[PDB]
């Protein structure tokens, strides 16, 4: 089953710094890079000339790497071109690394890169009606700090799960960094039939990458090798910032409030509640 | 058979033979006469002429004509020599006819409105569904040894007799008796048919069946469902008042020429006002597979599909050996009946 394996990798030179920061600087993304170069060739080889692709994320944007948008106008030699064109495109990204790239660290364009990819896969499955590609993607992140749970990227994560579940796509995630199970990704890898591996920093992921991130392409008869439980007690009370269990959900706003609610104008939309409905909620 | 079902009151329609004198020149309404009357050497009592004298005497608007082609046009040209009606009506039966003289009978009645394109019209909802089938009776060494020994046409009944062929017939019999259906079998043999009619044992029309017994069996066949199998020999065509067709079986397949096989197919497959069965006109053809008429059994199949009748092949009979009266079932008795039929 020609399976399209498209890898998306995020490189913030502040987050690749964190990969250098974690442990010692005993090897930066190159170990992961040389892992990925070998990994991309293999799946390319596995199924019937099944294609591959690559996108990245700046500190301040995103761009395609292996698809290699129109610019002019060994080992099988397709591994070579896939690697080397990727190697040449990425080194072009590193010259697009400077203070202004180091500037826009407020956002993480991970949300934009993955929405753009779903346009690309919907684009390829739309064109490759013949030889319907049993495609499936991958995620590698350099676990960085300074934002315990950046919660500004929650809705696009979850919306694209639906499209991913809507377009029937298993999604596998590997987190390289400090031990922070990205709950929203952890739900995400759970939500759409994927595998979660929170690998450590400096292990050559090649042994890890081959084991659990080859599960799906078309196969899915094999035990996914995800990380531990995928608890779905979802986002903290938007008002509180504590994860709620018996949530208190406002109105058409649908904001999640804890036992906190101000009784008026829940802190995500200007929606007054019937004080009777507030009192009815308080009849306990 | 129709004109009283039809609106026609035969009190007006004086039928004429000139052995059948009837009311000429006093017949108040429409008329039904016939060619040999209306002109022939069979102009044979002055009833005939006087009807014709009346035919000329009364001015006629329209002339309904049925199979003008068989009788010479010259008399039709003589029922076109004397009277000068206004219209005729040529309800012809064949595309090419012996009355296709360079002055065609088309240019004397009215132009062609209806022709070999019988797809526009009958498909508008007249005709019902007719099913056709061709069972391959299994081979048994003697038939082939019988095939081997003679290349002559005498193999004819030698595969017709196949006792397995009798069996499949009996299945339909119990089957159409179970369905309350009616069965026509086209079997021109006398002995093996008797041998089979003896093998079945129902009041049976057979070779030279008494018409009363034919009628009796027919009455016991269409109104009574107990006798749900009759065997029509070559004496059905032509002609009898052929009985209704729900399950036609044909055994003999030489019956040449093939223009007749269009006739018989049309003739033997009569209409049926029964819709309890999903294929209310079964056509069957029990043929011993691997015998002389595989060439001629293949000749019948191409004919029907050209005629367009729904057709099929049922050689995987449901309970083929599970039917009653497996008389002569064994290859030996098929051989024995084959010896029985080598006499015929």
């Amino acid at each position: 089953s020609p399976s399209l394996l498209t890898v998306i990798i995020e490189i913030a030179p502040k987050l690749w710094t964190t990969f250098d920061e974690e442990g010692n600087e005993k090897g930066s993304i190159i170990k992961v890079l040389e892992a990925l170069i070998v990994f991309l060739n293999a799946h390319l080889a596995f199924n019937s000339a099944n294609k591959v692709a690559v996108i990245a994320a700046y500190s301040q944007g995103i761009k395609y790497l292996y698809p290699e948008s129109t610019s002019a106008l060994x080992x099988y030699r397709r591994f070579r071109n896939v690697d080397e064109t990727l190697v040449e495109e990425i080194y072009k990204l590193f010259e697009l690394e400077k203070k202004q790239i180091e500037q826009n660290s407020q956002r993480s364009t991970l949300a934009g890169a993955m929405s753009a990819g779903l346009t690309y896969v919907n684009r390829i499955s739309k064109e490759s009606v013949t030889t319907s590609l049993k495609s499936r993607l991958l995620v590698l992140t350099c676990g960085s700090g300074s934002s315990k749970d950046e919660i500004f990227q929650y809705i696009p994560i979850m919306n694209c799960i639906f499209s991913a579940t809507k377009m029937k796509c298993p999604i596998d995630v590997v987190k390289i960094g400090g031990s922070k199970e990205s709950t929203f990704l952890q739900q995400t890898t759970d939500a759409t039939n994927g595998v979660y591996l929170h690998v450590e920093s400096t292990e050559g992921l090649i042994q890890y990458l081959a084991t659990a991130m080859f599960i799906d392409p078309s196969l899915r008869p094999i035990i996914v090798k995800p990380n531990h439980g995928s608890v779905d007690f979802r986002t903290s009370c938007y008002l509180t910032g504590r994860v709620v269990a018996v949530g208190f959900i406002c109105s058409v706003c649908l904001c999640v409030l804890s036992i906190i609610p101000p009784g008026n104008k829940c802190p995500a939309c200007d929606s007054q509640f019937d004080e009777h409905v507030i009192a009815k909620l308080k009849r306990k | 058979q129709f004109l009283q079902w039809c609106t026609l009151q035969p009190e007006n329609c004086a039928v004429f033979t000139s052995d059948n004198k009837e009311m000429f020149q006093t017949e108040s309404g429409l008329v039904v006469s016939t060619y040999s009357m209306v002109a022939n050497t069979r102009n044979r009592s002055h009833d005939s002429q006087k009807v014709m004298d009346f035919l000329t005497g009364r001015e006629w608007g329209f002339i309904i004509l049925d199979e003008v082609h068989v009788v010479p046009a010259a008399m039709f040209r003589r029922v076109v020599s004397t009277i000068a009606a206004h219209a005729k009506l040529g309800l012809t039966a064949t595309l090419v006819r012996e009355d296709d003289k360079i002055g065609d009978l088309n240019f004397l009645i009215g132009p062609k409105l209806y022709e070999a394109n019988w797809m526009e019209l009958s498909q508008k909802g007249h005709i019902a569904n007719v099913q056709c089938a061709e069972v391959w009776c299994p081979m048994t060494a003697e038939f082939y040894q019988e095939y081997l020994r003679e290349t002559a046409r005498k193999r004819m009944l030698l595969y017709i007799m196949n006792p397995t062929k009798f069996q499949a017939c009996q299945f339909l019999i119990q089957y159409h008796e179970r369905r309350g259906d009616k069965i026509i079998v086209f079997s021109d043999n006398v002995y093996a048919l008797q041998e089979y009619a003896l093998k079945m044992g129902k009041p049976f029309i057979y070779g030279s069946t008494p018409q009363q017994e034919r009628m009796n069996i027919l009455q016991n066949f269409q109104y009574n469902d107990q006798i749900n199998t009759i065997f029509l020999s070559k004496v059905g065509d032509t002609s009898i008042d052929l009985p209704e067709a729900t399950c036609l079986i044909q055994i003999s397949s030489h019956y040449g020429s093939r223009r007749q096989e269009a006739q018989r197919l049309g003739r033997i497959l009569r209409a049926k006002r029964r819709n309890d069965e999903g294929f209310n006109a079964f056509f069957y053809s029990l043929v011993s597979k691997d015998t002389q008429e595989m060439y001629y059994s293949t000749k019948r199949q191409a004919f029907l599909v050209d005629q367009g009748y729904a057709f099929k092949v049922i050689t995987h009979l449901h309970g083929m050996e599970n039917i009653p009266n497996l008389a002569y079932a064994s290859p030996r008795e098929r051989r024995e009946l084959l010896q029985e039929v080598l006499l015929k």
Partner: protein, 66 residues
């Protein structure tokens, strides 16, 4: 693990009988006869069974084709 290989010839008992008549005609290469509808033969000689079956039918049939 028991597995008895061979050439399972399944047909009508008569052609079987003929084939068996034919098989008896070149020295009983039929290893076993599973039932009236099956035969177990050595594949080395089934080829010639049909050949003589062909010849004997070619000797028998001769193809009138009327």
């Amino acid at each position: 693990a028991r597995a008895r290989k061979g050439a399972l010839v399944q047909c009508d008992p008569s052609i079987k009988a003929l084939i068996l008549q034919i098989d008896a005609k070149m020295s009983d290469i039929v290893l076993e006869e599973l039932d009236d509808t099956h035969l177990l033969v050595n594949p080395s000689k089934v080829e010639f069974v049909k050949h003589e079956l062909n010849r004997l039918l070619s000797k028998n049939i001769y193809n009138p084709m009327d």
